[PDB]
Amino acid sequence: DEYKTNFIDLTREALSLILQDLKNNVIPKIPVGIEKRERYKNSLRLCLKSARNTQHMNELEPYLELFSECIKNSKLPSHMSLKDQLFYLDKLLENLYFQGVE
């Protein structure tokens, strides 16, 4: 038996579910302004596009690292505090900005 491919598929699916939770259950509800909400929306669209396959798995490592507490606690951001949701969304934006300068 070999589990490598199924494990990779599973980590991609878990990341995608976290991102879908942020886009559909967190971002429409959070008490932020229109400008900030649009920035969040755009960045989650980019992240979901990036996560929709397993062809460059190196690119998903920063996201699995960012969301490590979600995974190890089996808990999605929409079931965490507002502070935690804002942390994750702001860290996504920061990661994407500095990745797009490094």
Side-chain angles (χ1 to χ4, degrees):
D1 286 75
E2 185 54 53
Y3 309 108
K4 175 171 167 271
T5 306
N6 287 337
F7 189 63
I8 289 167
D9 286 335
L10 278 156
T11 59
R12 185 212 64 84
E13 203 162 328
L15 174 57
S16 181
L17 205 49
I18 290 160
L19 299 174
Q20 289 167 226
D21 182 71
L22 283 162
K23 175 195 138 191
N24 301 326
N25 296 329
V26 174
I27 285 169
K29 171 184 277 204
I30 47 177
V32 307
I34 295 294
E35 182 174 351
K36 200 163 178 212
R37 191 189 314 279
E38 306 284 356
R39 282 190 335 250
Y40 289 161
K41 222 195 163 162
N42 169 64
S43 100
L44 267 296
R45 180 171 33 80
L46 299 172
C47 290
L48 280 157
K49 185 189 297 289
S50 168
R52 70 180 39 160
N53 68 52
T54 60
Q55 273 169 348
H56 298 264
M57 286 301 306
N58 60 296
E59 292 172 4
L60 311 195
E61 188 269 338
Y63 301 153
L64 296 161
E65 157 74 28
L66 167 63
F67 295 119
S68 58
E69 295 289 325
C70 297
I71 291 167
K72 94 173 176 161
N73 293 305
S74 302
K75 185 159 218 167
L76 289 167
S78 66
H79 299 282
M80 295 163 67
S81 69
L82 176 60
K83 289 200 199 315
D84 287 341
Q85 298 168 355
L86 289 173
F87 163 83
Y88 281 130
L89 291 159
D90 290 339
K91 253 294 208 273
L92 271 185
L93 292 175
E94 184 224 67
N95 276 206
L96 267 71
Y97 177 85
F98 284 120
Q99 161 209 295
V101 174
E102 284 172 42

Short mmCIF file of all heavy atoms in Angstrom, two decimals, residues 93-102:
data_model
loop_
_atom_site.label_atom_id
_atom_site.label_comp_id
_atom_site.label_asym_id
_atom_site.label_seq_id
_atom_site.Cartn_x
_atom_site.Cartn_y
_atom_site.Cartn_z
N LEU A 93 -3.21 38.30 3.37
CA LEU A 93 -2.83 39.47 2.57
C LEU A 93 -1.33 39.76 2.69
O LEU A 93 -0.67 40.06 1.68
CB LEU A 93 -3.65 40.69 2.98
CG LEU A 93 -5.16 40.72 2.65
CD1 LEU A 93 -5.83 41.95 3.23
CD2 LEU A 93 -5.40 40.66 1.16
N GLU A 94 -0.76 39.67 3.90
CA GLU A 94 0.66 39.96 4.09
C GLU A 94 1.55 38.94 3.39
O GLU A 94 2.51 39.29 2.69
CB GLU A 94 0.99 40.00 5.58
CG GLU A 94 2.43 40.38 5.92
CD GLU A 94 3.04 39.50 6.99
OE1 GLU A 94 3.26 38.30 6.71
OE2 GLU A 94 3.29 40.00 8.11
N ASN A 95 1.26 37.65 3.60
CA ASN A 95 1.93 36.59 2.86
C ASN A 95 1.92 36.86 1.37
O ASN A 95 2.96 36.81 0.71
CB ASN A 95 1.27 35.25 3.17
CG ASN A 95 1.79 34.61 4.43
OD1 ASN A 95 1.75 33.39 4.58
ND2 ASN A 95 2.31 35.43 5.33
N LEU A 96 0.74 37.15 0.81
CA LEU A 96 0.65 37.33 -0.63
C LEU A 96 1.44 38.55 -1.09
O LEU A 96 2.11 38.49 -2.14
CB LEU A 96 -0.81 37.45 -1.07
CG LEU A 96 -1.54 36.16 -1.50
CD1 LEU A 96 -1.83 35.22 -0.33
CD2 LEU A 96 -2.81 36.53 -2.25
N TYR A 97 1.39 39.65 -0.34
CA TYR A 97 2.16 40.83 -0.72
C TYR A 97 3.66 40.53 -0.72
O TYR A 97 4.35 40.79 -1.72
CB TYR A 97 1.85 42.00 0.22
CG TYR A 97 2.69 43.24 -0.08
CD1 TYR A 97 2.29 44.16 -1.04
CD2 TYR A 97 3.89 43.46 0.58
CE1 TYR A 97 3.06 45.29 -1.33
CE2 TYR A 97 4.67 44.57 0.30
CZ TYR A 97 4.25 45.49 -0.65
OH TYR A 97 5.01 46.60 -0.93
N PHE A 98 4.19 39.99 0.38
CA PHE A 98 5.64 39.84 0.48
C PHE A 98 6.15 38.70 -0.37
O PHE A 98 7.29 38.75 -0.85
CB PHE A 98 6.07 39.64 1.94
CG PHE A 98 6.05 40.90 2.73
CD1 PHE A 98 5.25 41.01 3.85
CD2 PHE A 98 6.83 41.98 2.34
CE1 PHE A 98 5.24 42.18 4.58
CE2 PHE A 98 6.82 43.14 3.06
CZ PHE A 98 6.02 43.26 4.19
N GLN A 99 5.34 37.65 -0.57
CA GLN A 99 5.66 36.65 -1.58
C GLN A 99 5.76 37.29 -2.96
O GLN A 99 6.61 36.91 -3.77
CB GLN A 99 4.60 35.55 -1.54
CG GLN A 99 4.51 34.69 -2.79
CD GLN A 99 3.10 34.15 -3.02
OE1 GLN A 99 2.59 33.35 -2.23
NE2 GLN A 99 2.46 34.59 -4.10
N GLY A 100 4.90 38.27 -3.24
CA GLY A 100 4.92 38.99 -4.49
C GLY A 100 5.91 40.14 -4.53
O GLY A 100 5.80 41.03 -5.38
N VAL A 101 6.84 40.14 -3.59
CA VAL A 101 8.04 40.98 -3.66
C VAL A 101 9.32 40.20 -3.42
O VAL A 101 10.41 40.64 -3.84
CB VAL A 101 7.93 42.17 -2.67
CG1 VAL A 101 9.21 42.99 -2.61
CG2 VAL A 101 6.78 43.09 -3.07
N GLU A 102 9.26 39.02 -2.81
CA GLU A 102 10.41 38.12 -2.70
C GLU A 102 10.51 37.24 -3.95
O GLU A 102 9.50 36.94 -4.59
CB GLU A 102 10.31 37.25 -1.45
CG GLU A 102 10.64 37.98 -0.15
CD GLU A 102 10.35 37.15 1.09
OE1 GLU A 102 10.66 35.94 1.09
OE2 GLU A 102 9.81 37.71 2.06
#
